[PDB]
């Protein structure tokens, strides 16, 4: 009874990112999935979007270019497949961690596991996107 909970295989290219990768998450449509992560996850089967989410953060933990911009506590979090905490000023109530967003919504036929359709957002930005 939720599309995002149906199994599928990951596809898509992503984009080159730099040190300001997660800074981009609070702006515009959010930050892209890094090309380097897309290389690792392409063609893997996922039983739910939540399982895909876990895999993204585990690959972040393993990637020295992506993990080096997280502090020790956030490193511990992504090692467990958790989403890392944003700065306080980008949090909204009990939503305190980076959120994965579908640029074309799944409800409007957007692809669930196409990484070219996925963005990384802060809670503050994700809420604003979904309200225009």
């Amino acid at each position: 009874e939720s599309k995002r909970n149906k199994p599928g295989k990951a596809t898509g290219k992503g984009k080159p990112v730099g040190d300001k990768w997660l800074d981009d998450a609070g702006k515009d449509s959010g930050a892209p999935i890094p090309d380097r992560i897309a290389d690792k996850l392409r063609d893997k089967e996922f039983k739910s979007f939540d399982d895909f989410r876990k895999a993204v953060w585990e690959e972040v933990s393993k990637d020295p270019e992506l993990s080096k911009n997280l502090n020790p506590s956030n490193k511990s979090s992504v090692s467990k497949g958790y989403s890392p905490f944003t700065p306080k000023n980008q949090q909204v109530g009990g939503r305190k961690v980076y959120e994965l967003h579908h640029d074309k919504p799944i409800s409007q036929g957007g692809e669930v596991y196409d990484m070219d359709n996925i963005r990384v957002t802060t809670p503050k930005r994700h809420i604003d996107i979904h309200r225009g």
Binding site: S73, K80, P84, P87, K88, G94, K96
Partner: protein, 82 residues
């Protein structure tokens, strides 16, 4: 565990160490501890003390405890249990 005056310093360090190490069974449990920490400390930086330190701050568990202890002492707040 309703206020920071309910914790000894050693007990608070235990809480902070658990958070820093993500020593939980779910992301939900971790978020709950972080929320608890922010409520206990009353510090304006909130979770930034743990996850977004300002340049040169000591973000080890003992460093965070020191930052909290000093801020509370200097800003008229009750301290740890003896």
């Amino acid at each position: 565990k309703h206020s920071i005056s309910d914790y000894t310093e050693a007990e608070f360090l235990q809480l902070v160490t658990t958070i820093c190490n993500a020593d939980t069974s779910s992301e939900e449990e971790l978020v709950k501890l972080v929320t608890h920490f922010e409520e206990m400390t009353e510090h304006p930086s909130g979770s930034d003390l743990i996850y977004a330190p300002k340049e040169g701050d000591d973000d080890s568990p003992s460093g965070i405890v020191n930052t909290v202890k000093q801020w509370r002492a200097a800003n008229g707040k009750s301290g740890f249990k003896q």
